[PDB]
């Protein structure tokens, strides 16, 4: 078996090896690299996603996010505060503003430091889910607008065609800014390029060893695990490496800088934060490996998780007996 031990693995495709996306998921998985659940693609020094980033600053983050903490700096939830609109030109500039920016530090490993010390004080706004792509029309390799859609995939996989349509989502991000313990809609693979800025923290737990990572939640998390079968879902846990390190929990991190994919495997736990103003793009997608995944995921009816339109058709087809439980959930 290779990657036994459930390593991170880094990839660094030739421009050869870059041109055909799927071919190249499945060499990954021939190395072993989805038993981490995360792996790193460094694209080849001739591919670039644009020309340059020189005109974003008017994008729009009509619903910028700031994220509250409650609990202890180890175990915490986040909500949700919905803020006044702002232009990307505005966010960074709070960004970079004394009350929001990266406080000095030595390296990546002191600033990991200060992050889990002092996260739950402050409450950093994030401009995250925004629909759009900052992938210049004209990249063919590895753009994320550009790739095969899920519905395609079940088609091809399953012979039903289904509703639904799948496009990427825009991250701006500022220190501290933070994304709690999940895996993807209906444990999908996500693909995640930095675009810009400074880098993204991210843990992993690997999919062989999940339901690990869900025990200990719902010890953590004890009126949430009450409250829903699947409280992951809502994607508002935190749990620091030093808590799953005490309790025995596989696991791995690695930091992301601008220019570089990540990669999430089914069923891949995992939970992040970003150093410093960025700009990241993220899509789900799937392969035929997924299918099985798709059929086993587990699911939030309590109400709180509430996803997109799509996901209707994978429930209905893949998991038709929890389709009218979840739809209520839903509804
Ligand atoms: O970048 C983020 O805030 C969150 N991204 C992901 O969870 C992902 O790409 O799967
Ligand atoms: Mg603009
Ligand atoms: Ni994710
Ligand atoms: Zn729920």
Redesign the pocket.
Same mark, same amino acid.
């Given at each position: 078996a290779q990657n036994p031990n459930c390593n991170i693995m880094i990839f660094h495709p030739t421009k050869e090896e870059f041109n055909d996306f799927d071919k190249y998921i499945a060499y990954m998985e021939s190395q072993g690299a989805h038993r981490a659940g995360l792996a790193k693609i460094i694209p080849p020094k001739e591919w670039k996603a644009r020309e340059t980033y020189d005109n974003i600053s008017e994008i729009l983050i009509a619903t910028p996010l700031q994220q509250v903490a409650s609990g202890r700096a180890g175990v915490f939830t986040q909500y949700h505060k919905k803020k006044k609109a702002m232009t990307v030109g505005e966010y960074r500039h709070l960004a970079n503003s004394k009350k929001y920016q990266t406080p000095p530090h030595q390296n990546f490993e002191d600033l990991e430091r200060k992050y889990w010390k002092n996260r739950i004080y402050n409450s950093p706004i994030?401009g +995250?889910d925004i629909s759009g792509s900052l992938f210049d029309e004209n990249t063919k390799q590895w753009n994320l607008g550009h790739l095969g859609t899920i519905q395609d995939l079940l088609e091809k996989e399953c012979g039903v065609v289904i509703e639904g349509v799948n496009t990427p989502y825009l991250?701006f @991000?500022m220190w501290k &800014?933070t994304?709690a313990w %999940?895996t993807?809609d209906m444990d999908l693979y996500?693909?995640?390029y930095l675009h810009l800025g400074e880098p993204?923290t991210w843990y992993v737990v690997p999919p062989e060893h999940g339901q690990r990572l869900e025990r200990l939640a719902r010890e953590l998390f004890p009126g949430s695990s009450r409250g829903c079968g699947a409280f992951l879902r809502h994607k508002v846990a935190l749990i620091s490496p030093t808590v799953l390190k005490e309790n025995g929990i596989p696991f791995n991190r690695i930091t992301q800088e601008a220019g570089e994919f990540?990669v &999430?495997f089914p069923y891949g736990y %995992?939970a @992040?934060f970003?150093h410093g103003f960025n700009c +990241?793009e +993220?899509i789900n997608f799937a392969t035929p490996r997924w299918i099985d995944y798709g059929k086993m995921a587990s699911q939030c009816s309590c109400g709180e998780a509430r996803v997109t339109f799509s996901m209707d058709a994978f429930v209905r087809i893949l998991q038709p007996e929890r389709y009218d439980l979840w739809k209520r959930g839903q509804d």
């Open positions: 994030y +995250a991250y @991000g &800014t994304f %999940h993807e996500s693909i995640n993204k990540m &999430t %995992h @992040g970003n +990241a +993220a």
